[PDB]
Homo-oligomer: 248 residues x 3
């Protein structure tokens, strides 16, 4: 038996949208100590790790690890119809091919239950990059999102430059060339070396949807190494993305 | 001859929008009692009956029964460009071939007038499915619309089950299966007996636009009988839908 | 060689949208009196003339008249991603083959800079029409914009009839006939004679977007003559459109 109730469905809604943007199916590693989702785009260029610790749920009951694989396409379609202010309980009875989502009015006047079928999803082949990040920049989630959208009016790749002075996002295409410089503090830059890597704006966009979860976003970079985009879900979880640098 | 001035065009705007979306053309039964529209889908599964009693208009003048046929498509377009807070005088003259919608601002500083050509539409073979309903449910028009839209993510058929306890809406499909139960009281139920019938969501959605006209909606049900979705237009008229169940 | 900064980019964002509506490339006559675009549509029936005077900018510098060709398409695509309340400094150095738009935060914490390639625009046949205007209707900018959107539901040609009582905009088509009458007083008419011209609505629509720059619009008319449609920019310049009568 499994049960995770959240006070506000908004979290699940704002979460699945962030993930469905990268992959359309994923396995929910529901183990005691929290609910984890790990997955890679078909390009094998970009990975999402999502942890929700057990302190995140008003009710959480996972005695033994049970992996549940799920169609994010369907799940997303169901969550769209669930009022955010309503409660949401995700429940699985052992040896079921379906998992149950239950929502209730704060008033208890209305109850909605939605049953979705489970899938068989093979375990992610690749795993979190084992890297120590030299340069770390933190900035307002929404500003990050705007910048990617903006840089995309120019090209499909963004050249991020970390410097003591601040980060410079730059891009070029037919429309022409542009850049956005963010003066460091507010932009909290931590640097050991002046690092400057380039990344695919398509994925950066997918990531930026994290603005729905956290007011600020931590971007961690390492020379000739994947990047991490971390979104903190309060101190009750996190959403982390990893993307490959563009190389010549 | 005919003259039907309403103080606020909002009504006509909302009504035509509702009636359109089941039918493209309709005859306006201009009787000295009021205006009436009776019509049926191409599928001939769904009927719409609308009554606007003379009390609804600030100036009704229909000495004799005139049947005016109109393209709801063309009417909807002309109405979309009319401020709802403006007057709307519908008018026809002997053998005019055209109807005249006239609109004025409260300040009488702006006058808009539009002329639409009448169509010849044959009378409706089917008649109001006059019947007595065992069970009668009233709820918030808006919640109804939400429920129909929500159930439409699962399937195209809705199963309504009426119990002293309350009303549950069930739908199934590839996405999976979901249900929304409403606890009886503002859910006002009224069952001389328990009943559970299934309907097409497509036509339910067409009806659910009645919310723009009324904050509550009354649903009447009889076994192996068309249902009725009623929306009261103040005390000046009503909009009624009747739809054939699905039985196996 | 040229620098022109404005406090709020709102103007540029609102201006380019207006003039990108009519033409995709335009030359900017930069000179010490200010910036000036004068362009015709390809059909040669419509002419836009825009003047921003030096006092429009918080900082203007143009010793020598240079002509700059810009792709209003690209310029549009850039200004879309510039915050209204950020400042915008348009600059050009001797034989640079690009202009630089530079965007500063009020708080100076963010700097965006974009470079657009300059075009060689050959069209300069534009000759401001003589202005012996007899009639001068002036009305709310957004009402004129609505009237044209509305008249488009009927036809693609509008007939403006100016009389002592007020102005009538008439249109006809498959949907039917329509007209909006605005009585004089805030409609301010000024005629020497009853005048009635007809005009293409496609262009009147392009012009109407001027409502973003001015709370009021001025239409000037003369028999057999192009009308003028003038949007005042705050006494620091203008946006004027001229359109050939369709009575030809
Ligand atoms: N460079 C010059 N000295 C010059 C050359 C031509 C010109 O033209 C005057 C009449 C026509 C241009 C005034 O605006 C239009 C445009 C198109 C039509 C049409 N084709 N219906 C009607 C009126 C004015 C000045």
């Amino acid at each position: 038996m499994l049960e995770a109730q959240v006070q506000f469905a908004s979290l699940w809604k704002r979460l699945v949208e962030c993930i469905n943007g990268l992959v359309n199916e994923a396995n929910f590693d529901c183990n005691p100590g929290g609910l984890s989702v790990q997955a890679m785009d078909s390009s094998h260029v970009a990975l999402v790790h999502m942890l929700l610790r057990d302190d995140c749920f008003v009710k959480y009951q996972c005695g033994r690890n049970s992996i549940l694989g799920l169609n994010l396409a369907s799940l997303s379609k169901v969550l769209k119809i669930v009022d955010s202010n309503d409660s949401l309980s995700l429940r699985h009875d052992d040896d079921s091919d379906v998992v149950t989502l239950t929502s209730e009015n704060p008033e208890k006047t209305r109850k909605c239950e939605y049953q979705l079928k489970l899938l068989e999803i093979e375990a992610e082949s690749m795993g979190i990059p084992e890297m120590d990040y030299r340069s770390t920049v933190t900035l307002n989630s929404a500003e990050f999102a705007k910048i990617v959208r903006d840089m995309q009016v120019f090209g499909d790749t963004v050249t991020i430059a970390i410097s003591k002075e601040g980060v410079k996002f730059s891009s070029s295409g037919d429309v022409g060339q542009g850049y956005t410089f963010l003066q460091a503090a507010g932009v909290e830059v931590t640097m050991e070396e002046p690092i400057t890597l380039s990344f695919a704006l398509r994925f950066m966009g997918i990531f930026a949807k994290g603005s729905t979860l956290s007011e600020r976003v931590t971007l961690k970079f390492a020379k000739d190494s994947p990047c991490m985009v971390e979104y903190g879900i309060d101190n009750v979880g996190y959403l982390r993305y990893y993307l490959a640098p563009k190389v010549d």
